[PDB]
Structure formats: structure tokens, C-alpha cells
Amino acid sequence: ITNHMPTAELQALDAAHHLHPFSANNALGEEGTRVITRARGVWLNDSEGEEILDAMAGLWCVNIGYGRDELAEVAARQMRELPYYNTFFKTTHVPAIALAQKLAELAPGDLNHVFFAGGGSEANDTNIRMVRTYWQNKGQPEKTVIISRKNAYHGSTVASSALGGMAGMHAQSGLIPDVHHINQPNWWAEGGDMDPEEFGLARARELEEAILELGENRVAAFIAEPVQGAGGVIVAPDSYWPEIQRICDKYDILLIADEVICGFGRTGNWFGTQTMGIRPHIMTIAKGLSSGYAPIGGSIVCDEVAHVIGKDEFNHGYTYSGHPVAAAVALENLRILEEENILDHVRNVAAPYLKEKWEALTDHPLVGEAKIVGMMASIALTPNKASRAKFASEPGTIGYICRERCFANNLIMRHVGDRMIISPPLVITPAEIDEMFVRIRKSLDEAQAEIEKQGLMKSE
Amino acid sequence: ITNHMPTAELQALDAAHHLHPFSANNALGEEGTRVITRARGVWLNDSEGEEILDAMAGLWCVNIGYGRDELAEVAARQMRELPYYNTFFKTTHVPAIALAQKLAELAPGDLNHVFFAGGGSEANDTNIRMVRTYWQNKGQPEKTVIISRKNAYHGSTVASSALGGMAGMHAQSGLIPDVHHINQPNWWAEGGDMDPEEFGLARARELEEAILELGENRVAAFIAEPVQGAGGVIVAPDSYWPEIQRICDKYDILLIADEVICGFGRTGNWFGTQTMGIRPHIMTIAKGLSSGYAPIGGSIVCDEVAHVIGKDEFNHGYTYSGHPVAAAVALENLRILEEENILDHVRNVAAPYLKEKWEALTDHPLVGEAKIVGMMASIALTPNKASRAKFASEPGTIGYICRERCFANNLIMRHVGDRMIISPPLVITPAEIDEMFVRIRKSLDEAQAEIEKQGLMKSEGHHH
Ligand SMILES: [Cl-]
Ligand SMILES: [Cl-]
């Protein structure tokens, strides 16, 4: 079993033993998976030798791009010295110390302390436990309710599924008590005839209304992604975040900013919370933290919350919390992002160039809107732009059609319902972006022809 | 910031920024954490130059021991070639395929399918969601309750905490609805006047009682570690597991064997499941999977459960599910365990030697019982073995004193209540085992003296 085995045999072995995330696995197995074998820069190769443009950066995470062999070098060296030790036994190691200090340095405000975990789901479980423990330690054991949003995504543990706003996840043991969901600020889909800025305000004010309905004395936290990622890159109207922040200042609740996707340069700053000018008590991190080179996530925590949690035993943590190889890899990732000025590249070169071409996609007959913040973008596909119509088919039928075209054209672009999404490596160049657009326009053209032929150009 | 920066300075930076698991972090920060800088074989070094015998194998996980540079080479090679790709987009990579195939091969019976996760806690979240979805898919959405046990440990997410049986965890948003806990088969502490085999039967029959109290139609699954690890290495009487298995056959519920600790040679087999002769529908894996050299976990799932789950979208999984570097490292770990015959080393050499010396610990005045399965072991500390007495002090008071003596004597042996536990690397030699026991006996003698100094050598009911 090597990259030398014929593709059909690899697929057969995968189908026989490997259960894939977010899949209908029996059908997946008979259809056969695409086998990815190497990557460099923004490009992948599969087992057949296709050259594929990865406009999704792995899974919103390979921020410095592929082929950064400095990280392999750092990983091997750490693995030889100390490949594992725990942080449970009044013990630590130097990679955990250095990474936590670097994260404290990069995080805004007084976000100065780090609880490590394996990834974003595990870190949001830390957050749930930590905010509720925080309020107990403050003498307010009644404050337990966590407010989140419809169409949010916060991970895939039972409790993290519960925070997210995905009905299909809730229905598969994705619920826990004392989570409440307000509306998402998706103007395109839900704004009606409201002005986008008035819509932003009304959607934000739902937080205050929820707090008063539940009782401030019962509310522990509000959690939100700065830009909704897995929900389809939903960019809130500009009025939304300042109104949320005002509400959070007024009431005695913790603000958690989920930075799992937005983190580490994705929105054109170190954190989406800097882009949106918000002041969270906790930030959830993973993905770009290590550019996906090693599994690691965590919670960056303000002074007050860390002090209060520190006053007694906090009966929480994971074997791999602070893993020294993963921590060394993450530190090397951050060193590249910082020392090679990747954020300047994003802000001055890649983000402006992408924006101009991305937003120009509304000239395509299928494209009703084109939204982008920094290096995450979406387009809404519609059969009638005049009424911002949804398709009459199940959401995702059209998105799936376009997605299959992108993959057949050697482009990784994902769908979320009938929105198409990108999230390229931060290091992508104007030249690479041009080629991305050649493949996007070809896929959109071919998708539209398929949609028209199959009689699917129908409004709901 | 390097292994060369002085200890006090490293400690100050750790206190400034690093929140630790399962700790009182403010007090920890003022004490100063211990900084581990390197590890070779079964030995750690700290930043003061102390050499420490790691009788806990990191955290029940460094099964091939430290210093196996083959995994570093395999890791670096994978990272240069393909450091990450997702398994979400109808895509896969060779490390995931090779590892899933290898796990299927080592797993018993028809446990042939693997769902990857980041570690044990995430993998038990997979299991909760999978067993519940399974019953929904069969048109029985009432089957939601998972039965587990007091003093179980199944991870530290909200829901896998709920499955664990630790009150301190549950109190800190660590409990969810539809989890029911039956009693644990700790004969030493809880057996009363019962014979151990009668106690084992009665402890197992609580599963049947709970199923009938809840209604079989409401029960999705029972989950258990073959040997309770974090709970104090609690080895059930011989009668216990055959009776749990009979009950799990009798009633229509799924059986989850949590193999997070017991897996990968720890009980002297590939799985605690083999050792105890049980037939689970799902096994949880992590820790020993990669000997802790890379974060990775998962769930190994029997044919029929996998098939039913596979019939529709299973809306679950993690960014780092199947991580190709972690998966390459895990495969190389399994290669070493298998091709250097480490399980033979355990079965023929280390386990019988360890058992001999461990069980002889009961000649020590503090040591009431000494229990051991393969390479996981515990002792119960007592002021009076003849009545299996508990100390007058709250459990853990005496265990703490002992643990502090172990730590000062450069031995990683931990306490749970007034039980001391070890879980050394599988590859420990009889000679290293001897040196471990020199440190164990010294620590027990100093513990006994410290207990006497504090006025704590009294049994329960006898404070006055
Ligand atoms: Cl939309
Ligand atoms: Cl006990």
C-alpha cells in the first residue's frame, strides 16, 4: 500500500476500511474517492498525476501553502528530543511555553493565556466548560446559557455541534441543554426588502432580546465566528458587529470569538476579531495555527477569565493538550507568517487583487452576489437575481453541480447549499489567482449549461 | 526561549501564559511547573538535570518508549510530501488508507472500519453520535441512553466527560442528559462482605437492572474500559466481564469497549477486548495508537454498524480526522510494535516479571492489595489490610503524600484517591523494572513516615 499501488486498488482499500467525515459512506465507497498524494505551494497532485489548484487550502487551513519543509525539519528535531510529554502532572515542556507566549503576543487586548487542545471542536468544548466554570467560581452558578446562531459552525463534538446552527447535525445527537440560537445576519437569503445596514442592526439586537428573554442572570456567553465560514462565508452587514459589541459591553456575559477559520491571516489580520474591532474574552483557535501541518488547537483567554478559572481545579484537558511536536510545528508556522510578512502580502497584494476579480463575478448569469473578507469568499448562485431567488431543488443540488465541474476542471472550490466558497493559501500570487479564475469561470459556464439542460433553472 | 534558558525564567513564562489541564493554575503558577526537556527509553530529564523514571509512559501512551527516531524520519518524510489533506471532499490520502487497513487487520472479529479523530475524547463523541444515529437509522429514535459506570473515564469533551463517572468533572459542565451510571467493580473498596466472584456477578447484573429500569427500548449502548485506568487501575473480578457480555448479548444494545488506555499492547494483547474476551460493536482508540508521538485517535466499528451508518449522510468529523502525518507516524508505531515483537516482550518477559514484583508489594505495611493486568497496575494504601480499611482522612490525602514522595524520588507514579498507579513503557527491561521498585519501596517508606508525622495513620471510624 503505497502511492505506487494502482488508483482503483487504493480506492477499494479506502472503501473497505475508512469512514469519511461528513459523508454518505456506502455510496462514497462505491463511487470511489480521489486520492491526494503530494502538494506544493497552492497545487496538489492526485494518484493519477493531475495538477490541481487548491483554492480551499486543505480545509481553510494551509495558510502558508504546501511544501514548507522548514516545518518538517522542526517536527523531526522535536520528535527526537521529546516527542511527547503531558502538561497534567505539574509539568510542562518548552514548546508549550514558547507557543503560548507567542500566541499571547499576537492576540489583541489582554488575551494572554492559552489552554491547548487537539483542534477547534475540542477547544470549543474547553470554552463551554470554561465559561460555565468561570461563572460558578464568580458565585453565579445559574449563568449557564450559551447563545450562538443559526447556520453557525463551531465543531463536531456533541457539545460543539450543539453550539453550531446546523439542523442536520442537531438531529444526529448534536444537542445539549442551555444553548440558544439567534438568527444569522445573512442579508442575501434572509434580509427581505430591508436595507442591509438596518438588517445588520436588527439581527444584532436579537442578542439583547435573547438576553432579556432568558434573563441576564441565566446567560453565560455569546459565541460567534467573525465571518461564518462553513455556513457559506456569510459576511455580516458592517453595522452588525459594533451593535453586538455594544450589547456585550452593556450586559454581564462573556464573548467568545470563534477564530478557527478566521484566525492567522485569513481575514487580512492575525484574527477576525481585529478585522471586526471586537473585544472577546476568549478566542477559539486551530487550522491556520499550524497551517494544518500538525493537529493542534486551543483557546486564548483574557486575564480576568484565566485568573478566575485558575483559583481552583479545572477538571478538564486532553492527553495531547500542548503536544510538543505539534506545538513546535505551530511555532515555526507563526515564525514564517510573521518573519516573511505574509500579512503584508495579503493586505497589499493578494487580498486587493482577489477582491476586484471576486466581486466582478456578479456579471456571470448564475451569480447573484459575491462576498469577500480578506482571503475567504463566497458567491450565491440563483435562477433569478431580481428576487434573490433560491432554487426550487433542495439547497445543494445546484452547488453540487458546480462543485463537480470545479473538480473535473482541477480546481478545489467547495459548495455550501447553493453558495460556492474559496479560502486559498494566503501566499497565493496574482498569477495563481488568474489561473483560479480561468477554472472558476469555466466551471460556472459549464454548471449553468447543465442547470439549463436539466430543467433546474427554477425559482422556489 | 530554549531548553537552555534557566528554569526559574521558563517557569515564569509558563505561569504567565499556559493554562494546564486538570490543574489549579494560579497555585500551580506560584509553585513553578517542572520543565521536561528530553526523554530517552523510559527516562525523562528535567531542566534541573534530574533523570526521572517515567513509570506512566507519558500519559499511559508512550508504548514503544522514548527515543525511537524512526518515527521522526517517517513524520518528516510525510510532511515534506503531503503535510495535510482533508478526508471531507470525497478525497483520501495513502496514510489514512494504510492505517485504516492495518487497524482493521489487528482488530478482532468484524471490526473492520475506522473513523479517525484527534484523540480519545473526540473519538467517544464520534461513538455517542454514531450509536444514536445508528438507532435513528433503524427507525428506533427512542434508543438514546448510554450506560456507563461511576469512576469510569472516557475523555474530557462535554459529552465524553458525561460518559466518564467523575463527579468533579460533571460539576464543571461535564454532564449531558441520557447517560446513566452503574456501580464500578472495585471489590477492595466496595465489596463489603461479598466474595470477589459474587461481587463481580452482582456488579455486572446492575447493567441488566439499569436496562430494565430505563426500558431496553430507551437504551442505545453500554460503554466501558476493559480495565478502569484513570479510576485507579480497577481490575474487575474474573466473573465480571463474562457476565457483562452475557447481558450485552441478551439485550438489544451496542457495546463500546473504550480501548484508549488498554489498546496497543498495554494489557498484553493488541486490545483489552481480547484479554477480557469481549465482543464490542465499537472500540475507542488513541494514546498507544501512535505511542503518543503524534496526536491521533479514532473508532473501530463492526461491519453491521458501519453499514447502517454508511446508508446516509453522517454529519460528523474533524478537520484533522486522518491527518496524514499523524497517520504515517501511527502506522510506523504499529510496525515497530508488530515487527520487533513487542507484544511477545510483554507477554513472555516484562509482564510476568512485573507481576511477580508488583504483587509482592503487599508485604509493605501500607499496601493492602496489588492488582495488575499486563503493563497497568495499582496498589491500595491502607492503615489496616486485614479489614481492607480506608484511612480516616478523605481519600487522596494519603495518596497525595505518596505521590509527592514518588515525584521527589524521580519516579512518575500517580495517585487516584489512596490508590497508586503505574503504566510503564511496554519495552521496560527487567533491570529497569528493578530500579523502578527501588524507587517505589523508598517512596512507600517515606510516605509511611510522612503519614505518621502528620498524625494520619488512622482508619475510618477512628479519628478520635
Ligand atoms: Cl444564501
Ligand atoms: Cl480502592
Side-chain angles (χ1 to χ4, degrees), chain A residues 1-3 5-460, chain B residues 1-3 5-464:
Chain A
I1 310 175
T2 42
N3 315 72
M5 171 170 284
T7 295
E9 288 174 33
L10 291 170
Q11 288 172 313
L13 277 166
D14 195 87
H17 305 291
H18 178 206
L19 298 173
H20 289 246
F22 293 84
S23 297
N25 276 289
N26 299 347
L28 176 57
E30 42 196 37
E31 187 196 333
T33 51
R34 192 167 194 173
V35 182
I36 307 301
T37 57
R38 348 196 295 147
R40 159 160 87 290
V42 301
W43 302 102
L44 321 166
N45 299 147
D46 66 18
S47 64
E48 292 294 286
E50 302 299 306
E51 176 80 342
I52 301 146
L53 188 40
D54 186 9
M56 279 302 299
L59 202 51
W60 316 81
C61 67
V62 186
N63 291 6
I64 62 173
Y66 303 99
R68 291 314 298 267
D69 291 359
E70 300 87 344
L71 281 57
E73 181 63 22
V74 161
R77 171 182 315 122
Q78 187 54 49
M79 287 178 63
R80 289 178 204 115
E81 187 70 347
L82 178 69
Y84 177 73
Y85 201 68
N86 78 71
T87 50
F88 285 54
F89 291 171
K90 299 189 170 197
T91 45
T92 191
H93 47 68
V94 167
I97 300 173
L99 178 61
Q101 184 236 258
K102 178 100 254 162
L103 295 166
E105 181 185 298
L106 297 177
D110 66 342
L111 293 156
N112 293 329
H113 311 262
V114 188
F115 197 102
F116 291 111
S121 301
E122 278 186 10
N124 273 329
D125 280 57
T126 304
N127 297 342
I128 291 176
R129 296 190 74 206
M130 182 175 299
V131 302
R132 292 170 165 175
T133 298
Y134 171 83
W135 290 113
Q136 297 181 28
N137 289 3
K138 301 277 289 171
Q140 304 188 264
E142 231 185 341
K143 318 248 287 153
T144 59
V145 178
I146 295 164
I147 306 168
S148 179
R149 300 180 302 182
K150 293 182 202 305
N151 198 41
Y153 189 82
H154 296 297
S156 181
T157 59
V158 174
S160 273
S161 295
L163 301 180
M166 303 309 175
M169 303 175 76
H170 298 159
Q172 299 178 332
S173 182
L175 294 173
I176 72 176
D178 297 327
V179 176
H180 182 263
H181 292 88
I182 61 176
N183 290 308
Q184 52 158 353
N186 179 348
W187 177 86
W188 174 270
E190 300 173 16
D193 293 313
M194 302 195 63
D195 168 69
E197 299 306 306
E198 279 304 308
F199 174 81
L201 286 172
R203 286 277 142 126
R205 281 161 184 165
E206 289 191 27
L207 177 60
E208 177 155 26
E209 285 146 23
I211 292 162
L212 296 168
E213 170 67 24
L214 296 155
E216 176 187 15
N217 61 299
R218 291 206 64 237
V219 176
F222 175 63
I223 184 172
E225 300 149 274
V227 183
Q228 295 165 251
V233 186
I234 309 306
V235 184
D238 294 297
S239 68
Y240 180 75
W241 279 111
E243 182 66 1
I244 295 295
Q245 188 59 65
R246 177 190 76 76
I247 291 155
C248 285
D249 281 332
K250 185 172 183 192
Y251 295 92
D252 212 16
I253 70 164
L254 298 183
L255 173 62
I256 317 169
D258 184 330
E259 294 281 351
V260 163
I261 286 174
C262 291
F264 304 97
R266 182 63 52 197
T267 69
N269 287 295
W270 284 106
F271 300 93
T273 95
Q274 291 152 325
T275 302
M276 296 308 170
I278 56 169
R279 295 169 307 270
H281 301 87
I282 305 184
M283 284 186 326
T284 323
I285 56 158
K287 291 180 190 281
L289 170 59
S290 64
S291 286
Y293 282 65
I296 181 165
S299 309
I300 309 185
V301 176
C302 75
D303 289 340
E304 147 77 12
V305 174
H307 178 71
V308 169
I309 291 287
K311 291 178 159 189
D312 204 338
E313 292 291 336
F314 175 50
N315 307 306
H316 176 74
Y318 307 106
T319 300
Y320 294 139
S321 281
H323 193 283
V325 181
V329 171
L331 184 73
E332 182 66 1
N333 179 61
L334 305 180
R335 184 197 63 77
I336 292 172
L337 286 162
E338 183 171 24
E339 291 185 357
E340 297 183 7
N341 299 113
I342 307 297
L343 298 183
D344 287 342
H345 173 76
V346 171
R347 294 167 175 132
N348 296 336
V349 178
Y353 194 82
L354 184 56
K355 180 171 190 288
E356 189 270 337
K357 290 210 157 48
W358 190 261
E359 295 182 335
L361 287 171
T362 52
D363 68 17
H364 191 281
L366 246 25
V367 173
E369 69 161 8
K371 309 291 295 199
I372 180 165
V373 181
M375 308 294 287
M376 49 195 310
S378 62
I379 49 180
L381 308 186
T382 179
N384 195 350
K385 304 178 194 197
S387 55
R388 321 206 295 276
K390 340 262 134 139
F391 280 98
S393 41
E394 292 287 338
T397 307
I398 272 63
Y400 191 84
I401 288 167
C402 184
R403 217 265 293 162
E404 287 290 293
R405 293 322 303 151
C406 294
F407 279 51
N409 288 307
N410 291 330
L411 168 73
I412 309 302
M413 178 181 226
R414 188 219 193 347
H415 72 111
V416 181
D418 297 323
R419 311 182 67 85
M420 306 307 304
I421 52 168
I422 65 168
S423 177
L426 303 186
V427 291
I428 193 168
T429 62
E432 281 156 1
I433 291 167
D434 288 338
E435 180 60 12
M436 190 181 63
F437 278 82
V438 168
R439 309 172 182 211
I440 286 160
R441 296 242 178 212
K442 164 113 290 97
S443 307
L444 279 176
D445 287 351
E446 295 178 334
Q448 182 198 334
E450 290 187 342
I451 295 156
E452 290 168 0
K453 266 173 179 289
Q454 295 171 30
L456 295 174
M457 260 309 171
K458 199 185 295 201
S459 306
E460 153 204 280
Chain B
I1 310 186
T2 66
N3 299 104
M5 177 181 265
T7 302
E9 289 189 40
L10 289 175
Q11 290 174 326
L13 284 162
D14 187 88
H17 303 297
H18 180 199
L19 291 166
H20 296 232
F22 284 94
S23 298
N25 278 279
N26 294 351
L28 175 57
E30 42 218 359
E31 278 153 28
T33 173
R34 186 169 201 175
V35 183
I36 304 314
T37 54
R38 68 201 280 281
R40 302 283 185 266
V42 300
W43 299 100
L44 318 164
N45 300 114
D46 69 22
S47 62
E48 294 293 294
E50 305 284 348
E51 185 189 48
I52 306 157
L53 179 20
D54 191 0
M56 282 298 297
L59 201 55
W60 316 86
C61 65
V62 187
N63 286 12
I64 64 182
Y66 300 96
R68 299 300 307 258
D69 297 350
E70 299 88 344
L71 285 69
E73 153 253 341
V74 167
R77 186 172 67 242
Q78 183 62 41
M79 294 179 61
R80 292 194 295 271
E81 167 94 341
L82 181 68
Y84 175 75
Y85 200 70
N86 75 76
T87 51
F88 287 55
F89 294 169
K90 310 188 147 162
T91 43
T92 192
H93 55 249
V94 176
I97 301 174
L99 183 57
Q101 185 266 305
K102 185 50 71 161
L103 293 165
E105 188 201 300
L106 307 173
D110 59 0
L111 289 160
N112 289 323
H113 308 268
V114 186
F115 196 105
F116 294 112
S121 302
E122 275 181 8
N124 279 324
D125 282 71
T126 302
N127 299 344
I128 292 167
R129 299 189 68 209
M130 183 178 300
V131 307
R132 289 177 172 169
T133 299
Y134 174 89
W135 295 111
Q136 292 171 180
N137 289 10
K138 258 16 171 71
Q140 294 168 74
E142 300 302 280
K143 288 185 69 83
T144 71
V145 175
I146 305 177
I147 301 167
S148 177
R149 301 181 296 187
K150 292 177 172 80
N151 201 39
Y153 187 86
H154 298 293
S156 187
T157 58
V158 169
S160 71
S161 171
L163 292 185
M166 307 300 191
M169 298 181 70
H170 294 159
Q172 293 176 334
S173 181
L175 192 61
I176 63 169
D178 295 330
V179 182
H180 176 98
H181 299 76
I182 69 193
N183 288 301
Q184 63 160 350
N186 185 348
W187 176 80
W188 180 266
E190 292 174 29
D193 297 305
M194 301 186 73
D195 138 277
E197 306 320 306
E198 285 181 311
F199 176 77
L201 285 176
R203 278 306 203 253
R205 286 174 187 163
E206 296 196 19
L207 172 60
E208 174 158 36
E209 305 161 20
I211 289 166
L212 299 167
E213 162 191 326
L214 296 153
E216 178 181 16
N217 61 311
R218 278 205 76 240
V219 179
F222 171 70
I223 184 170
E225 309 155 81
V227 179
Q228 283 164 265
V233 184
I234 306 298
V235 177
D238 295 341
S239 66
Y240 180 79
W241 278 109
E243 180 75 346
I244 293 290
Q245 185 61 67
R246 188 186 63 83
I247 297 167
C248 291
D249 281 329
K250 191 165 176 176
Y251 294 100
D252 199 10
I253 69 168
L254 301 179
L255 175 64
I256 312 168
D258 183 327
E259 294 279 347
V260 161
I261 289 173
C262 297
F264 305 100
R266 173 67 51 198
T267 71
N269 289 115
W270 288 105
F271 301 96
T273 278
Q274 295 150 325
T275 303
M276 301 306 175
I278 60 166
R279 292 171 274 102
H281 295 91
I282 303 169
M283 295 189 306
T284 317
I285 57 174
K287 294 190 186 290
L289 179 48
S290 67
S291 280
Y293 285 59
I296 184 167
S299 306
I300 311 180
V301 184
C302 73
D303 279 348
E304 198 271 339
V305 173
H307 173 74
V308 170
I309 286 329
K311 284 175 49 153
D312 292 291
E313 291 294 333
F314 182 44
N315 302 310
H316 172 84
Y318 307 102
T319 293
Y320 297 139
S321 284
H323 193 286
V325 176
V329 164
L331 195 72
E332 177 70 352
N333 172 71
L334 300 181
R335 192 196 60 73
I336 289 177
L337 279 164
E338 184 165 38
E339 285 168 19
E340 302 184 8
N341 297 291
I342 294 171
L343 268 54
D344 292 335
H345 171 72
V346 175
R347 287 182 298 237
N348 300 339
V349 176
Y353 193 80
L354 182 53
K355 176 182 170 74
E356 194 196 271
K357 302 225 168 330
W358 187 263
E359 290 180 341
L361 284 171
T362 61
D363 61 15
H364 191 283
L366 273 179
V367 176
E369 69 166 11
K371 295 300 276 184
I372 184 164
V373 174
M375 302 299 288
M376 51 193 304
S378 62
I379 52 183
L381 303 186
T382 174
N384 182 58
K385 11 191 130 182
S387 67
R388 322 207 302 268
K390 296 174 178 65
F391 285 97
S393 295
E394 185 72 30
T397 305
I398 265 60
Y400 179 89
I401 283 161
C402 188
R403 178 292 282 299
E404 287 302 297
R405 288 329 302 167
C406 299
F407 212 60
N409 291 325
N410 297 332
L411 165 70
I412 313 301
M413 179 163 82
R414 312 304 289 181
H415 79 288
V416 184
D418 296 335
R419 300 189 79 78
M420 313 299 302
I421 58 176
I422 64 167
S423 174
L426 312 182
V427 295
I428 193 165
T429 54
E432 285 153 347
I433 284 163
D434 285 341
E435 175 54 30
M436 190 181 60
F437 279 82
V438 163
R439 294 164 198 231
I440 285 157
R441 295 197 173 268
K442 185 187 192 163
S443 299
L444 291 165
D445 295 347
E446 299 182 333
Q448 183 183 343
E450 182 62 28
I451 294 160
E452 295 279 8
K453 185 174 187 205
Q454 300 194 26
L456 300 182
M457 194 70 72
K458 308 166 151 170
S459 52
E460 146 183 74
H462 309 298
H463 282 264
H464 143 59

